[PDB]
Amino acid sequence: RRNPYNTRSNKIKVVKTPGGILRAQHVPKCGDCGSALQGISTLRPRQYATVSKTHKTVSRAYGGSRCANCVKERIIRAFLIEEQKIVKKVVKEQTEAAK
Amino acid sequence: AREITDIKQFLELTRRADVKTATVKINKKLNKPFRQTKFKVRGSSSLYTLVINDAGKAKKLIQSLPPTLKVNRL
Amino acid sequence: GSDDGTVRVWEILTGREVYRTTLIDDEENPDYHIECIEWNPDANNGILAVA
Amino acid sequence: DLDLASTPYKTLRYHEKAVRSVNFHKKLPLFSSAADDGTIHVFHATVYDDMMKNPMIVPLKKLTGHKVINSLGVLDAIWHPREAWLFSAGADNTARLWTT
Amino acid sequence: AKFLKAGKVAVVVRGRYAGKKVVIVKPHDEGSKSHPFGHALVAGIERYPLKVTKKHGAKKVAKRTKIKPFIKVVNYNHLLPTRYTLDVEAFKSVVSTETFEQPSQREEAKKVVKKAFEERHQAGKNQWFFSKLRF
RNA sequence: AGCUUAUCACCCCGGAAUUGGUUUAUCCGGAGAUGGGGUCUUAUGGCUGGAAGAGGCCAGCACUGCUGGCUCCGGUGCGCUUGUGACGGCCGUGAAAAUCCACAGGAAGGAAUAGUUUUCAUGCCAGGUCGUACUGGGUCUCCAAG
User: Fold this and answer.
1) CB contact B64 to D (< 8 Å)
2) Which residues contact C31 (CB under 8 A, 6 or more apart)?
3) Most-buried pick from B17, B67, D31, E32 (CB within 10 A)?
4) GO cellular component annotations, sorted alphabetically (chain B)?
């Protein structure tokens, strides 16, 4: 190509053409923990516009952006927060029972 | 190019009547040599090639070809 | 073959329960039971596989 | 069909419940399907050995007599090795044999 | 003291039912030849009923109240026990162990569970259980 | 383009310390290892189609091309270029946007002479303009055989 420099975006591979001569040929992460999402193809982001949602998304809540490990953690945290809020309301009622 | 082992699918493709020509390629191989042959048709999306090993199957496929479809050898 | 732990053979025409065999002593056991049975296609052997 | 395409040649959906089993006839050109609804159906089916024609499958008769228990029906069914007879099995603790 | 009972409420953690409330119909801590691990039979709701307002028509109200349940064996590891409880004698037998692993036995149990949940939610009680736990 | 294929990573049973696993480099395990059973990321390789009809290596005649074969099976690094995967640390916690993709969400719409949805597959049409010639002690740059 017109670019003669060794920029990492213009690296070349050696491929043996059928004619016998050698010719130059041009060559999903979790949103909470950052680990790569399993079951998702590691294709170019622009190439996902045609792949079916089945390959891009796993059959789970937060499946397309979480590894299901932090999903459990956040579900447990939400349940504990709700339980504490109920406990806090009970404490408030107990305090109001005297005033 | 694509390869399909469905004989009836190839027959339907030839029966489409919207293909100008087809080609049958004769080959030689051994495992006891055998006369391997290939059947190829031109599709709108991609070329379809059918692999046939038995001579009788190739003859039956050739017979099944409608007369309206021309078959250029090699 | 049934879940009662007993395999029974019935004549095609007469329908008599000519022969029987017990596979599991605990007929009421829910852990496992007779899954499938198949006769050997080859003749002159009379082998009945019982799963 | 092993030669038509990867997809089914024809899709049939008539049973009122899960289709437990379908068995081909060893000799005659017939086959029957079994479902949990307690109803057995028998279909004639011609299979050309080498002719480039699709198989002709048509229903023949709706067979009834099995009792549906626990949302289950004909657990298994097998054709006679040489005759047009169909054995049957169900959850009602009573196997049955069908004849013309 | 044990805290697992036929009326105990649990939340499924994984299996596409994350954060979904489920009722433990029959504890099976001892296990069986299938599922030897400690496990319990549970039933739950896959599609939470939508909010209903007087402005909605009669046809729309019925569609909104529609609930699609689910039934399957799930591990205690993925179960989050909850103090709340609900009646279980209505469908305990229907969702017994022999019901699973063989259709169409699952279809009738699912229909019965759907009918029971619809009856208990609409003009009923236990509104807390029939609510979407926003996590 | 169609099959097969992953070190790492993830899940379940199991509960170690009489301390086990293991890399060239020594870090990890009651915050769940050794051990047993499953998951996929498919880069990269194996087979097939493209495909031998191509190229190449030979041979005979015409005297202006045709006509006939082979184009096969291996081993290998103290040699060299390159990519990929997890690591060791340094101290400067480490460019932006366009474009594409992912999810909490449940308002909206879904029926009896064709109810909704088309991320499944096929069929159909279109994709302007600019440069592409050559050269390239006094500018830069890509490959470096025995």
Assistant:
1) yes
2) E32, E33
3) D31
4) cytoplasm; cytosol; cytosolic large ribosomal subunit
Query: What letter does residue B29 receive in the DSSP assignment?
Result: E
Q: CA D12 – C1' F113 distance (Å)?
A: 25
For residue A79, give both structure tokens.
């349940």
Q: Which structural domain range is residue B14 located in? A: 1-74
Residues of D in contact with E107 (CB under 8 A): 17-18, 71
Contact between D70 and D62 under an 8 Å Cβ cutoff? The reply is: no
- Partners of residue B7 in chain D, C-beta under 8 Å: 3
Which residues of chain E neighbour A60 with C-beta distances below 8 Å? Answer: 14, 16, 18
Same domain for A23 and A36, yes or no, is no
What is the rounded CA–CA span in Å between residue A82 and residue E80? 14
Interhelix angle B7-15/B55-64, rounded to 10 degrees, is 30
Number of domains in chain B: 1
Which resolution in angstroms does this entry have? 4.7
Spanning CA of D59 to C1' of F113, the rounded length in angstroms is: 27
List bases, strand F, within 7 Å of protein CB: 1-2, 6, 9-14, 39-42, 48-56, 82-83, 99-108, 110, 119-124, 131, 140-143
Burial class (CB in 10 A: 0-12, 13-18, 19+), E113: buried
- Rounded to a whole number, what is the distance in Å from the CA of B16 to chain D's nearest CA? 15
Q: Are residues A94 and A54 in the same domain?
A: yes
The residue ranges of every structural domain in chain E are 1-135
Rounded CA separation E85/B54 (Å): 70
Q: Are residues A83 and A71 in the same domain?
A: yes
Find residues 7-46 of chain C whose CB sits inside 8 Å of chain E.
30-32
Shared-domain flag, residues A12 and A38 = no
For E2-26, b/e burial (b = at least 16 CB within 10 A) is eeeebebbbbbbbeebbbbbbbbbe
Supply the range of the domain harboring residue A51: 28-99
Q: Is the CB of A35 under 7 A from strand F?
A: yes
In a shared domain, residues A15 and A33: no
What is the rounded CA–CA span in Å between residue D38 and residue D44?
Answer: 20
From B53, E101, E129, select the one nearest D72 (Cα to Cα): E101
My answer on whether A42 and A22 are in the same domain is no
Round to whole Å and give the CA distance between C7 and C2.
Answer: 7
Contacts of residue A18, defined as CB under 8 A and 6 or more positions apart, other chains included, come to none
Q: How many domains does chain A have?
A: 2
Q: How many residues does chain C have?
A: 51
Q: Do A19 and A66 belong together in one domain?
A: no
A57 touches strand F (CB under 7 A): yes
Question: How would you class C16 by CB atoms within 10 Å of its CB: exposed for 0-12, middle for 13-18, buried for 19 or more?
Answer: exposed
